[PDB]
Amino acid sequence: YPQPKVLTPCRKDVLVVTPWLAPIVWEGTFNIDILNEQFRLQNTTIGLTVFAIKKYVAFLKLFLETAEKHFMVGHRVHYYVFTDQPAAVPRVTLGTGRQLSVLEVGRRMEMISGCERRFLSEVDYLVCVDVDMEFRDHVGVEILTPLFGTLHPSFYGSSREAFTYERRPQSQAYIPKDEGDFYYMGAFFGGSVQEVQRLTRACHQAMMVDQANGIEAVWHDESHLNKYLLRHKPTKVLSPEYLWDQQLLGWPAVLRKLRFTAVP
Amino acid sequence: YPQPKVLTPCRKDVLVVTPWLAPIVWEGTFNIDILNEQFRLQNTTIGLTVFAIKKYVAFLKLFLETAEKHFMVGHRVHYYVFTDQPAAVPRVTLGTGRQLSVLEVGRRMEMISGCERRFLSEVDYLVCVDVDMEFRDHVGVEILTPLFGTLHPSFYGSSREAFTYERRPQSQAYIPKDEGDFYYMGAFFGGSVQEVQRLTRACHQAMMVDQANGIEAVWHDESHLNKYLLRHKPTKVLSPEYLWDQQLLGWPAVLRKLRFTAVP
Numbered sequence: 311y312p313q314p315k316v317l318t319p320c321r322k323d324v325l326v327v328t329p330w331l332a333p334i335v336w337e338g339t340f341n342i343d344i345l346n347e348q349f350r351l352q353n354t355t356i357g358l359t360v361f362a363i364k365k366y367v368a369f370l371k372l373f374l375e376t377a378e379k380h381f382m383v384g385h386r387v388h389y390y391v392f393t394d395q396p397a398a399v400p401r402v403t404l405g406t407g408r409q410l411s412v413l414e415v416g417r418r419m420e421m422i423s424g425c426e427r428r429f430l431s432e433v434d435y436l437v438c439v440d441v442d443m444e445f446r447d448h449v450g451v452e453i454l455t456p457l458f459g460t461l462h463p464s465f466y467g468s469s470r471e472a473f474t475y476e477r478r479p480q481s482q483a484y485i486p487k488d489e490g491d492f493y494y495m496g497a498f499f500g501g502s503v504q505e506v507q508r509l510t511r512a513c514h515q516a517m518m519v520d521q522a523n524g525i526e527a528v529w530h531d532e533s534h535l536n537k538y539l540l541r542h543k544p545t546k547v548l549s550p551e552y553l554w555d556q557q558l559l560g561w562p563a564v565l566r567k568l569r570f571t572a573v574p
Numbered sequence: 575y576p577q578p579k580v581l582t583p584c585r586k587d588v589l590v591v592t593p594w595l596a597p598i599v600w601e602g603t604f605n606i607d608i609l610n611e612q613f614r615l616q617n618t619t620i621g622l623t624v625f626a627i628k629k630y631v632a633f634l635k636l637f638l639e640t641a642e643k644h645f646m647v648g649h650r651v652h653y654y655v656f657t658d659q660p661a662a663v664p665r666v667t668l669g670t671g672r673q674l675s676v677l678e679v680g681r682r683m684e685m686i687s688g689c690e691r692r693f694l695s696e697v698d699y700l701v702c703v704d705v706d707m708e709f710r711d712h713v714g715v716e717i718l719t720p721l722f723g724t725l726h727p728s729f730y731g732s733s734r735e736a737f738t739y740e741r742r743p744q745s746q747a748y749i750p751k752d753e754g755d756f757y758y759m760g761a762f763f764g765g766s767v768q769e770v771q772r773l774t775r776a777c778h779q780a781m782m783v784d785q786a787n788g789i790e791a792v793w794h795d796e797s798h799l800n801k802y803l804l805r806h807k808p809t810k811v812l813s814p815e816y817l818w819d820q821q822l823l824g825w826p827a828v829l830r831k832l833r834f835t836a837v838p
């Protein structure tokens with residue numbers, strides 16, 4: 311492979327590492343051949359969780375189809391579809407080493423954290439996403455790490471005072487005006503099973519405290535996710551390549567790939 | 575602290591992440607306040623090993639004195655001085671939470687890997703350096719990670735064909751002309767105790783194989799270190815700030831700090 315050269319940065323237009331030395335994942339920063347070998351040597355299994363409740367079942371066909379094309383191809387994958395309509399889950403043909411479980415429900419942080427023992431035995435990493443999305447390009451093992459969040463596409467160019475963190479100190483999700491690294495979106499986070507269970511258990515515990523005190527954070531679990539990732543910093547951060555809306559935001563030059571996007 | 579901004583890289587003159595998403599540690603890439611808190615929360619202890627055999631005992635006073643000023647200040651530190659002259663080890667006054675053990679000898683990869691049980695109980699990380707050096711500036715927890723190597727100061731601008739890897743395929747340290755990420759120097763490596771014991775055990779095993787086959791790698795343990803870090807890629811790479819010789823190489827603009835340098 312091309313020899314990296316220490317005096318020629320690959321990307322000079324974007325921050326590629328956080329101040330706590332976590333990689334920020336952009337096209338041009340990783341050699342996927344290297345990463346694939348590292349992960350295949352450990353026989354890595356990746357769990358992907360998606361909620362499809364009521365009308366949202368309609369998004370599953372395109373979500374699954376495009377995950378088969380782009381999501382961890384070559385690696386073991388276990389999709390977990392949480393739904394109130396098990397009969398509505400479309401039968402999508404899967405590649406080898408890939409499987410799908412339907413988990414009938416009848417919220418997300420709770421549901422992710424009481425499926426606890428099942429995830430620990432079955433997968434090495436968990437990735438938690440929204441269902442009303444599609445994969446358009448590679449999303450692979452470059453994202454994998456103990457704990458990751460994703461830069462919210464509307465706020466990656468913003469100053470922190472503008473971040474819509476929870477601002478009331480009455481809420482467990484409270485973050486002062488002068489604190490904050492990034493604004494992560496709730497739609498794409500993950501990590502090792504142990505770290506995701508820690509995060510979702512914390513967020514759930516914090517939501518219950520707010521509920522008992524008669525307050526809902528301004529953006530619900532995303533507020534708590536942001537407070538958690540402030541205090542427990544992620545070991546990788548995904549760039550907005552990993553969570554985009556072309557309809558609302560276009561295709562800026564800074565995004566060399568649009569990998570996982572909102573459905574119009 | 576200053577808010578990192580995703581569209582303003584801190585350093586645009588240097589590669590700050592490897593193609594396998596390991597940070598390359600340069601001044602300007604890390605907020606040490608963040609890192610210090612993370613490590614102090616775990617009550618981190620760092621072991622620093624140094625060999626001072628024969629004449630090399632003379633380098634210990636300045637090495638230890640300047641380590642006290644610059645090396646992991648604020649954190650727990652355990653110096654391990656391997657020497658053939660225990661009475662020649664200078665008595666240097668140490669800061670709180672810091673200790674020094676004198677290990678009488680009567681090579682390095684062997685010696686590091688049979689002190690195995692002692693390191694596992696006493697320290698969380700191990701750092702292995704040459705003694706004929708001095709600390710001139712901060713060397714702290716930014717370096718800490720499961721496995722790290724350091725860019726050899728003479729070769730960081732070079733192409734791989736120029737790297738003085740072992741080129742004879744008869745040697746365990748053999749690396750083909752078209753393979754190779756970097757040229758790491760043997761003078762500064764480390765990691766978790768488990769990873770350093772794995773590395774030094776591998777290098778030792780490989781040296782014995784070469785010795786049994788009547789061959790010495792061209793640069794001895796540095797050759798084996800380079801073969802190991804090719805096949806087991808380091809989780810952080812230190813920039814040449816961490817291993818420099820101002821007499822031979824000056825003080826280039828690209829080096830904002832000279833942290834650990836050869837003694838003239």
Ligand SMILES: O=c1ccn([C@@H]2O[C@H](COP(=O)(O)OP(=O)(O)O)[C@@H](O)[C@H]2O)c(=O)[nH]1
Pocket residue numbers: 360361362363364365366439440441442
């Ligand atoms: O009725 C619903 C609402 C939400 N969701 C899941 O939670 C996410 C949030 O959807 P969004 O917040 O865009 O809709 P809203 O929060 O406004 O109901 C969806 O992607 C689904 O993955 C769902 O399955 N059914």
Ligand SMILES: O=c1ccn([C@@H]2O[C@H](COP(=O)(O)OP(=O)(O)O)[C@@H](O)[C@H]2O)c(=O)[nH]1
Pocket residue numbers: 624625626627628629630703704705706
């Ligand atoms: O007689 C010796 C040679 C080496 N060393 C240790 O191993 C390192 C290598 O020294 P160097 O290779 O510069 O000297 P040489 O390898 O030419 O003997 C030294 O820093 C010491 O840390 C030592 O203690 N005594």
Ligand SMILES: OC[C@H]1O[C@@H](O)[C@H](O)[C@@H](O)[C@H]1O
Pocket residue numbers: 462464474495496529532
């Ligand atoms: O301010 C945060 C909000 O940003 C909106 O753009 C987004 O659609 C919401 O889901 C929420 O993340």
Ligand SMILES: OC[C@H]1O[C@@H](O)[C@H](O)[C@@H](O)[C@H]1O
Pocket residue numbers: 726728738759760793796
């Ligand atoms: O080619 C590798 C060699 O480079 C020299 O500059 C160095 O002093 C030697 O110790 C060895 O590392």
